[PDB]
Each structure stands twice: as structure tokens, then as C-alpha cells.
């Protein structure tokens, strides 16, 4: 039997699914550790590896990219789990190695790849403490090209009165996503700052793992894909909307939680955002 992870329901995805809006024909790039294309609950359309030593993007030696991919797009069938946009065209852009780290060059190459291959949405469940002119130029070009760019805010928790949002989530062009639990409480590890945009479920999120497995992970890395998937649903309903429109709709229809420093605009609600 198929199980519907709490977080998919929490953001009100199933309402859209029942209406026939499932993300069909929207290309979502998962820029991460690759995706196990052999998982029965996923269908990978394409992608590319930017890691010099790991040339196959469809082999996930880490597990992280397969888990993020499941949240976006696990298939609607009689097994496994169910993604936010189960019909989305899923691309694996492998920029992290088996150890779950990668060089900035690799990540940026991956962003460039996604722009050149006309991805509609990019998900980056990754971040570092520092930016670069090249990282900023790449996300900016993506948005200027009409792509919706979403990223995890980071897992650095609080630090006095300072922002702890990582890059590239810190850039204005990117939607930075923090994590709540099933009670809508902010997860203690979720990064904070004025650059935080929205929240999505990020604690004990069940999804796909390599070798026909499922399991839970926690992090803003797990929250991000909910938003990327939500953007795909919106695009499936309103194919003519610009990235700006998609983003404003998500931000302006949230369930407001606490202060924006900790919660951004609040918890996304795809039902409301999809109008
Ligand atoms: Ca399934
Ligand atoms: K941001």
C-alpha cells in the first residue's frame, strides 16, 4: 500500500491532486547527491553529473538526493510514499559526492546546467557559510531566465541576533525555506534571519532511499523539496505564470506562524497559493 507522508498533507497538496493538478510537464531539477533511478517509486527523466569522480547522476552513493527527490515527486501508485508533485519531470543534477559534500564550482556548473536545459524549478537542499560572485551570478541568471529557485535555509539554528541562513538561500532571488514539525513549531536547527522566506515540514520526513528503501530524515534540506514540489503544482495549474508570480503567490498565502525572523511569511499552503 502507499503511505502519504504527513508533510505532503500538511501543505495541502492532496487537494490539488484530487483536482487533477499533479505537476505534469514541469521540469524540476534536484541539485544534490544524484537520484537512484532504479527506485520503483521514482521516475527520473534525465540530468547530469558535475562531480569528476562520480560520472553517473543516477547512482546515489549518499542517499540524500534520492530522499529529496521522493518528497518532490514519488509516484502516485500502490507502493511507497507520494510526492508533492507526483507527475513532475524529475532531473538528477549530481553536484555532491558520496560523502555529501561538493565544491562550489560543481554546484555552480549544476545551476548553469539547469538554466541551459530549461528547468522550470530548481531545488538546492544544500548551503555553505559563504557566497561568491559566481554563485550569486548563477542564481540571479536563473531567476532572470524565469526559473523558480528554492533552497534550504540551513540547519545552523540561532546565533544571538545574527542571520544564520546559508548560501545560496541568503540571496534575494532565491526562496529560502526553514523547517517546521507536524505541530507547526519551528525545528530547533532551522536557520533564521531576514532572508528566510517560508517554512515547510522538515522533521522526520519519510521518503525514498536507494535500493528500494524508505526512511526518515530531518533538516531544512527536507523542507525545501516541499516548496519546489509546490511550485510545480502551481505551474501545472497556471502554466502562464512567471516565476515572480509563483513566488508571490506562495509567500502571500501562507499560514502565518511567529515572527518572520524565525518563520518567514509562515507555512506554505499550496491550495491557497494555486487559486
Ligand atoms: Ca508511491
Ligand atoms: K532568500
UniProtKB/Swiss-Prot annotation:
Native organism: Bacillus amyloliquefaciens (Bacillus velezensis)
Record field: temperature dependence: Optimum temperature is 48 degrees Celsius.
Biotechnological relevance of this protein: Used as a detergent protease. Sold under the name Alcalase by Novozymes.
Activity regulation description: Completely inhibited by phenylmethylsulfony fluoride (PMSF) and partially inhibited by benzamidine hydrochloride, leupeptin, and pepstatin A.
Binding site residues for Ca(2+) 1: 2, 41, 75, 77, 79, 81
Family: Belongs to the peptidase S8 family.
Gene Ontology BP terms: fibrinolysis; proteolysis; sporulation resulting in formation of a cellular spore
Locations listed in the record: Secreted
Protein's name in the database: Subtilisin BPN'
Quaternary structure annotation from Swiss-Prot or TrEMBL: Monomer.
Cofactor: Ca(2+)
Role according to the record: Subtilisin is an extracellular alkaline serine protease, it catalyzes the hydrolysis of proteins and peptide amides. Has a high substrate specificity to fibrin.
Residues in Peptidase S8 domain copies: 5-274
Main subcellular localisation: secreted
Any further remark recorded for this protein: Secretion of subtilisin is associated with onset of sporulation, and many mutations which block sporulation at early stages affect expression levels of subtilisin. However, subtilisin is not necessary for normal sporulation.
GO CC annotation terms, alphabetical: extracellular region
Full-protein residues shown: 108 to 382 of 382
EC identifiers of the protein: 3.4.21.62
List of catalytic residues: 32 (charge relay system), 64 (charge relay system), 221 (charge relay system)
Reaction equations catalysed: Hydrolysis of proteins with broad specificity for peptide bonds, and a preference for a large uncharged residue in P1. Hydrolyzes peptide amides
Cofactor-binding details, from the entry: Binds 2 calcium ions per subunit.
Description of pH dependence: Optimum pH is 9.0.
